[PDB]
Design a protein around this ligand. Structure first.
Ligand SMILES: [Cl-]
Ligand SMILES: [Cl-]
Ligand SMILES: [Cs+]
Ligand SMILES: [Cs+]
Ligand SMILES: [Cs+]
Ligand SMILES: [Cs+]
Lengths: 16, 16
Protein backbone atom coordinates (compact mmCIF):
# COMPACT_ATOMS: atom_id res chain seq x y z
CA UNK A 1 0.00 0.00 0.00
CA UNK A 2 1.45 3.42 -0.95
CA UNK A 3 2.48 5.30 -4.11
CA UNK A 4 3.09 3.90 -7.58
CA UNK A 5 1.01 1.74 -9.89
CA UNK A 6 -2.08 -0.34 -9.04
CA UNK A 7 -5.60 0.57 -7.89
CA UNK A 8 -6.83 3.59 -5.97
CA UNK A 9 -6.60 7.35 -6.40
CA UNK A 10 -4.82 9.12 -9.22
CA UNK A 11 -4.49 9.03 -12.99
CA UNK A 12 -5.55 6.25 -15.29
CA UNK A 13 -8.73 4.36 -16.21
CA UNK A 14 -11.92 4.18 -14.08
CA UNK A 15 -14.41 6.56 -12.67
CA UNK A 16 -14.24 10.33 -12.48
CA UNK B 1 -16.14 6.43 -16.98
CA UNK B 2 -12.89 6.54 -19.05
CA UNK B 3 -9.41 7.98 -18.72
CA UNK B 4 -8.11 10.83 -16.58
CA UNK B 5 -8.13 11.53 -12.88
CA UNK B 6 -10.31 9.88 -10.26
CA UNK B 7 -10.37 6.26 -9.07
CA UNK B 8 -9.42 2.93 -10.64
CA UNK B 9 -6.31 1.58 -12.41
CA UNK B 10 -3.18 3.62 -12.90
CA UNK B 11 -0.74 5.82 -11.04
CA UNK B 12 -1.04 7.50 -7.62
CA UNK B 13 -1.95 6.13 -4.19
CA UNK B 14 -3.49 2.85 -3.10
CA UNK B 15 -2.64 -0.82 -3.62
CA UNK B 16 -0.15 -2.34 -5.92
CL1 LIG C 1 4.32 0.50 -8.22
CL1 LIG D 1 -10.68 13.21 -15.66
CS1 LIG E 1 -10.11 7.62 -13.58
CS1 LIG F 1 -5.27 5.50 -10.33
CS1 LIG G 1 -0.81 2.40 -5.94
CS1 LIG H 1 0.69 1.38 -5.28
Amino acid sequence: VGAXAXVXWXWXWXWX
